[PDB]
């Protein structure tokens with residue numbers, strides 16, 4: 001459940017490429033999203049919410065109007081997990097739709 | 100209120116082009132949407148929900164898993180008003196983001 | 199999977215008490231909810247939608263402004279399953295808070 | 298409409314009373330909510346989201362699973378206003394409906 005560099009090295013890339021980035025002193029990824037508006041932003045969170053509930057993996061996230069910042073780290077391992085990756089992947093599917 | 104003639108025959112045609120039909124036995128229009136899953140189906144509903152509350156115009160919708168069926172009519176006038184109109188168009192635009 | 203009669207007799211009453219009721223032409227439970235407004239109704243759909251997804255069991259539902267009708271049946275058995283019942287149980291919980 | 302000092306005294310009270318706080322640094326009130334789970338947490342955001350939109354007054358909130366931090370201030374007049382107040386009040390009703 002914890003990211004071994006081989007994994008990181010194979011997983012991280014596609015995310016990094018679209019904007020994901022690792023933080024300092026904490027094993028987690030972050031990304032800022034910026035929609036045109038709230039309708040879109042919320043709709044975007046809603047779909048994420050559904051899935052989060054579906055996989056039992058939650059994001060750390062902030063919102064103001066049309067911006068949403070997301071942070072992903074798994075609680076047990078206390079860093080990244082295959083879980084962060086998928087959620088993230090999923091998130092990406094959703095973001096592009098609105099945009 | 101109560102779209103007259105011309106407008107009707109100015110405004111609706113665009114909606115019909117897009118699959119909107121006229122309800123038989125009521126002054127309404129309706130259309131059904133089919134999505135890949137519920138995640139899309141609900142997310143779609145939410146965004147339409149924020150808008151409805153915002154305009155103070157609510158649809159009559161039915162949902163099952165990935166299908167969403169929508170009826171639009173104005174209760175005040177017991178029929179199609181421009182309210183319905185705009186809502187539909189917005190709904191269409193939302194449609195597109197997920198379809 | 200499909201409820202036996204012993205089963206129905208065990209689970210049903212509690213729901214029947216509350217206001218749920220078998221359908222006439224089919225093996226499902228129905229219940230119509232009424233709220234003060236849309237905010238509330240939509241709010242309540244949101245909580246069940248989350249729940250619906252968590253356990254992959256969805257409802258046939260209908261909404262207009264502040265009313266919500268919910269029909270439950272486990273499709274795969276083509277009638278009542280436990281799913282329907284748990285779900286119904288949950289819908290009851292959500293419903294009581296917005297009282 | 299950056300609320301007067303007279304105005305503050307009359308409105309804040311009920312708010313102050315419930316745990317709402319004023320921030321040093323900026324004209325804004327804040328509050329941290331805690332729920333039993335994400336479902337509630339999210340069902341909560343949703344109702345709020347609906348009001349936010351209706352009003353055209355959005356929050357600055359962060360969520361991580363079951364708690365949500367809310368920050369209200371009015372961009373328009375760079376400080377607290379009748380709105381943040383109204384809104385905040387509303388947030389409180391919604392919160393109550395969460396068990």
Ligand SMILES: C[C@H](O)[C@H](O)C1=Nc2c(nc(N)[nH]c2=O)NC1
Pocket residue numbers: 056057058059072073074075076
């Ligand atoms: C039991 C535990 O609450 C559950 O497995 C969850 N864990 C986590 C979660 N979300 C994150 N980010 N990390 C977790 O460890 N949501 C659900």
Ligand SMILES: C[C@H](O)[C@H](O)C1=Nc2c(nc(N)[nH]c2=O)NC1
Pocket residue numbers: 155156157158172173174175176263
């Ligand atoms: C005051 C009133 O109930 C409010 O403006 C609403 N009107 C309407 C509505 N929805 C419809 N379809 N028609 C209305 O006239 N939802 C909200």
Ligand SMILES: C[C@H](O)[C@H](O)C1=Nc2c(nc(N)[nH]c2=O)NC1
Pocket residue numbers: 164254255256257271272273274275281
């Ligand atoms: C694949 C299938 O659509 C999926 O397993 C679902 N099944 C069911 C469902 N909801 C109910 N009530 N019953 C099901 O059998 N929603 C999701």
Ligand SMILES: C[C@H](O)[C@H](O)C1=Nc2c(nc(N)[nH]c2=O)NC1
Pocket residue numbers: 065353354355356369370371372373374
């Ligand atoms: C046009 C303008 O962006 C709009 O009226 C909004 N204003 C505000 C808002 N949110 C806050 N907190 N303050 C505002 O002045 N969300 C929407």
